[PDB]
């Protein structure tokens, strides 16, 4: 078809359910929604995400360490059910029956700059240094007043996961917010359960799968 | 429809009828071209603009400040005239009869990340660190040679006026350019008056309206 | 028609027919793949290179000088050939008969805008700095481990050359790739030739021809 859209979360962005994975073993979970656009092989969307601390492990701090977390966007789910490693609920295509195939980065582009995802499935945040290619965005996201939330970043990337079973790729999101000096500690123990963040939609570009 | 588009403004940049909101309860004239196209809710565009200094106020320093505007771009301005922020004198949607509300930012990615511009209808610039939240293109600009313009940056943020009576969002564009140290101030009293800026048409993304 | 698409270059990236200007006068031989989707006037794309140091330069210091290279994208390589700098072999657009037109950069916006290339017509590298505008893209690249490669920029920039016979403006894209200081000098003529570097597919936005 020629134009396919793909969405996946809640857009009220109210059901905590989608799985994070953060630095040094952890994991967290979020509300987030996603959605692309795909036209000529050339995929367009947004993702949205945000949190509370009270979902937060309690270690570092967040204004010398900066806020990071991972998702996946797993487009093949439908048809490779363990690529789902962010526990996204099911996506609704456009126009319906069009193949989830078109939604995965472009498997040419992907070869030898696709990142291959730790295999334990609780716990595959890869730093932005190790990945092995990705693009760069820049935003600023929106909270609680006491973070301070100055500005982030979106790192997109092809990624592909061992427990997969088919050939399809999918797409890692790594997120850094970054806070002033002056904002209180999001991982403090004593921190008030209810500190979020809110990012904007943040588009992004691709390549991935045509004729 | 499966692909809209939408123009306001003057692609012969030739009409400095547009109005650009300054730091400082300062305004000024430029004139600009913006086009957006929106398919599966997405939407991408570019915004041109130009600008030269007899229409520009007369304060402070450009090399050391920047020079610094904003304009709003506002699709629902054919149901809502005072969202009309900027002035354009009208705009164009293909095919006609598809609604401008395409071209608005999504509300439910809008709830919590937009921006309530001040009250007032000729003062409405927020500087990007007052923005709730935005999105962030790096560029350079062009312009008369003796300016020696480097860089610029966009930030494009969902945003609403109190002043508006339809629930439909605006974008704000916050625009910065950077000179090197050597140029010659924008905003000298003594300057030239055809001292100018163009930039390029600027490429941006954002979530739309969709079902 | 709605939607179009254009594609040069090998998809495989196992071609290294593609002409890459560098600083210095020099040039030297990538493989490339490019592909442009155009709706509604804006068009959106990637460009994905990969080269080895066997076929590149043996002068300065990658390390400090950072990897430098450009590369032309010409649409109207079809009615005009002076206009092919880079030396594709071809182009293919979808649907057949959509005219060509529709990828290169707008020519209203182009006004003024515009970088002139150099004429002698291998080489019309132009350093950023002295192109007239463009447009920024962060990424990161991947290669041999040894290169220690952190990061890369992409600019998108409209161009002529004065050797064209038509109106129909060209895209510049000039790159930057940058090492982490211990890493080893693409251009030591010591080096081993299998040295490689490879981006992803990168992508970018412009304005082109409308109605
Ligand atoms: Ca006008």
Redesign the interface.
Same mark, same amino acid.
């Given at each position: 078809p %020629?134009?396919?859209?793909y969405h996946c979360g809640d857009?009220?962005?109210e059901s905590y359910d989608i799985f994070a994975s953060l630095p040094n073993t952890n994991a967290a979970k979020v509300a987030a929604?996603c959605?692309?656009?795909?036209?000529?092989? =050339?995929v367009?969307? &947004?993702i949205?995400v945000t949190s509370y601390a009270g979902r937060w492990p309690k270690v570092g701090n967040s204004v010398t360490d900066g806020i990071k977390f991972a998702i996946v966007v797993s487009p093949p789910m439908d048809k490779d059910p363990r690529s789902n490693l962010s526990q996204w609920l099911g996506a609704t295509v456009?126009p319906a029956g069009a193949t989830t195939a078109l939604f995965s980065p472009?498997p040419?582009?992907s070869?030898? #700059?696709i990142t291959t995802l730790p295999s334990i499935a609780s716990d595959w945040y890869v730093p %932005?240094?190790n990945? =092995? #290619?990705? &693009?760069?965005?820049?935003?600023? +996201?929106?909270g609680s007043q006491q973070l301070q939330l100055?500005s982030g970043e979106l790192?997109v990337?092809?990624a592909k996961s061992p427990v997969q079973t088919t050939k399809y790729e999918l797409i890692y999101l790594g997120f850094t917010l970054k806070q002033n000096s002056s904002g209180t500690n999001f991982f403090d123990p004593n921190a008030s359960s209810d500190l979020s963040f809110?990012? +904007? +939609?943040? +588009?992004? &570009?691709?390549?991935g799968y045509?004729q």
């Open positions: %020629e134009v396919a859209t857009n009220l962005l929604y959605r692309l656009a795909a036209a000529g092989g =050339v367009s969307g &947004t949205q456009f472009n040419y582009g070869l030898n #700059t %932005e240094s990945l =092995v #290619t990705y &693009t760069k965005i820049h935003f600023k +996201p929106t100055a790192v990337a092809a809110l990012t +904007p +939609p943040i +588009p992004f &570009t691709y390549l045509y």
